[PDB]
């Protein structure tokens with residue numbers, strides 16, 4: 001009988017941790033990379049090593065809608081994925097994609113960018129929709145602050161997000177079926193300001209969550225500043241719960257964030273890159289359309305274990321992509337997701353062995369030299 | 373205003389001829405290879421160089437049926453092919469694929485190998501069905517004689533085929549719409565027996581046809597015997613009309629048959645081979661699954677002009693075929709059909725220049741050496 005949500009840390013190296021999150025639908029190895037499920041077949045995504053995938057609540061509530069997904073048996077049935085699923089709250093895409101009808105402390109009303117219909121989100125509505133989807137990890141509904149943000153705008157959005165964090169907690173707790181079977185994460189805000197980040201961390205820990213996300217990063221600030229913020233922000237969160245850096249990111253972002261105490265990641269990059277003919281390798285990204293690959297019989301990456309690199313050469317993936325054959329994009333996408341999982345596995349193994357700091361240095365030296 | 377059917381011989385070398393057949397729907401360059409249309413897109417088949425394709429009346433009358441094809445606008449609309457189409461009579465597949473309900477001088481009744489329905493063919497019914505299909509070149513309905521055949525069985529089938537040839541002529545002539553716009557070919561029979569072949573040729577020329585096929589070959593006799601029969605059979609046919617060797621064949625069969633006066637060919641070989649991972653080349657056929665092709669960056673054939681050989685290497689087609697990707701079979705099939713058309717073009721050009729005998733010797737020396 002597996003538990004609702006149990007995070008265990010097996011080994012540490014400095015701020016880095018490796019361990020497991022046990023949930024009813026499966027075990028998640030940490031640090032973890034979550035592909036964004038919202039295409040490759042689900043058995044392909046699983047075979048790359050993914051233990052959990054992410055669903056975008058905003059996209060799902062527009063098409064086909066949360067009520068429809070529930071009638072179809074829930075998001076796991078809808079996606080053909082029977083392991084854990086994390087859903088975001090929808091609030092970020094409201095800011096970034098929709099046209100706002102109204103915004104206040106109550107919540108937000110917005111217009112679908114698809115057909116113009118009006119929708120509403122709030123701590124209570126977001127948690128309810130994530131319940132209809134049936135996801136395993138539920139994100140609190142918060143208010144995003146653009147980059148760059150003034151200290152006053154960062155502070156007012158963080159403070160609203162904390163009141164909304166309490167509202168998300170209470171909504172999640174109001175449904176026995178959700179509270180007994182799913183988990184709830186809260187989201188730290190405060191932009192780049194240490195005092196606001198501490199304010200936010202204190203508020204989240206007072207409410208109490210199963211995990212803590214660092215929000216408000218990866219939105220234009222640059223890696224140097226992101227790392228500086230992580231340096232003081234992650235230690236503010238409870239040590240014995242997972243730390244989730246939302247929307248990150250590039251392989252070097254992931255390594256440096258694990259060095260700073262992050263346990264969980266999501267990003268569309270591997271998928272977006274694969275559709276655009278870009279492959280991740282230990283020697284940095286490559287653009288497979290480049291003429292130098294037309295007769296290159298080596299795999300995309302000569303150390304990658306993925307099914308694509310066992311069989312397919314750069315030359316033949318180049319040919320497929322140049323012809324516009326969808327198989328080319330599928331192969332690149334599978335390799336990119338698998339490469340990300342192999343990166344996470346090397347991170348986990350190196351932390352376990354107490355050689356992650358060295359791995360990170362070796363990784364950066366090679367990744368940025370770009371001898372591909 | 374193009375004519376119903378006009379065959380012009382532009383150049384000769386010994387028994388070999390090159391020229392054109394002008395029909396309302398287009399010009400056919402001879403000697404001609406007809407792909408069997410009954411998949412690649414029709415624009416792809418045209419771009420390989422095919423001027424005319426063949427439709428199998430037996431398959432079309434079983435699924436979706438001739439009346440349905442007519443309601444859909446005819447075989448040209450059904451196949452997306454607006455150039456000439458030759459239809460066979462259906463009689464060969466009756467022998468080779470169906471279960472016969474009844475056979476007599478009247479015609480034949482048979483059971484569909486698909487759903488067991490009963491169908492009837494005869495000179496009159498075959499011509500009527502080919503009219504419903506709307507094909508440009510109509511084959512007389514004849515009676516096939518298996519290989520090997522006794523002289524008595526060869527003689528009785530040839531004699532019935534000639535009475536049926538007259539019946540086909542009269543049925544075709546009975547429909548003004550067909551007789552004014554299509555052409556009718558008769559089929560010489562007689563197995564390997566010179567006197568029966570002459571009997572058959574005399575009967576066909578007395579009736580009068582737009583073209584003359586050599587039937588009863590390519591059914592197990594071997595190339596040596598086929599060539600021996602062609603040696604005396606083709607000169608018996610009218611010189612100023614096209615000569616059509618049905619169901620042939622391998623590239624070396626085609627070359628030797630042109631040396632013996634044949635103008636037209638059809639075969640499923642290029643398609644069947646392409647689906648099975650076999651490519652035709654000037655150095656003989658190759659099996660692309662062979663390990664020696666896994667790192668071979670050369671095209672399937674290093675002289676072939678086809679779209680596949682401009683772009684795709686043996687290595688990558690090997691990869692596709694080994695993975696079971698349908699693209700692999702499509703590429704092989706396109707290359708094989710295009711290779712056949714390039715063979716016909718070299719035949720036409722070499723006859724025009726008076727160097728076809730030399731081309732044939734050079735072709736065989738290289739094709740059979742197999743230095744691929």
Ligand SMILES: O[C@@H]1CC(F)(F)C[C@H]1O
Nearest residue numbers: 042043046080081082083
């Ligand atoms: O149960 C399924 C097995 C799988 F193919 F890996 C995807 C799962 O949802």
Ligand SMILES: O[C@@H]1CC(F)(F)C[C@H]1O
Nearest residue numbers: 414415418452453454455
């Ligand atoms: O009219 C069409 C042009 C083509 F693509 F080559 C096939 C014809 O039937």
Ligand SMILES: O[C@H]1CC(F)(F)C[C@@H]1O
Nearest residue numbers: 037039040041042045079
């Ligand atoms: O996006 C596709 C693949 C997935 F596994 F991510 C879930 C869905 O079936």
Ligand SMILES: O[C@H]1CC(F)(F)C[C@@H]1O
Nearest residue numbers: 409411412413414417451
């Ligand atoms: O078989 C396919 C391709 C063809 F051109 F041969 C006719 C049909 O559309």
Ligand SMILES: [Zn+2]
Nearest residue numbers: 304306309335
């Ligand atoms: Zn790979």
Ligand SMILES: [Zn+2]
Nearest residue numbers: 676678681707
């Ligand atoms: Zn070719």
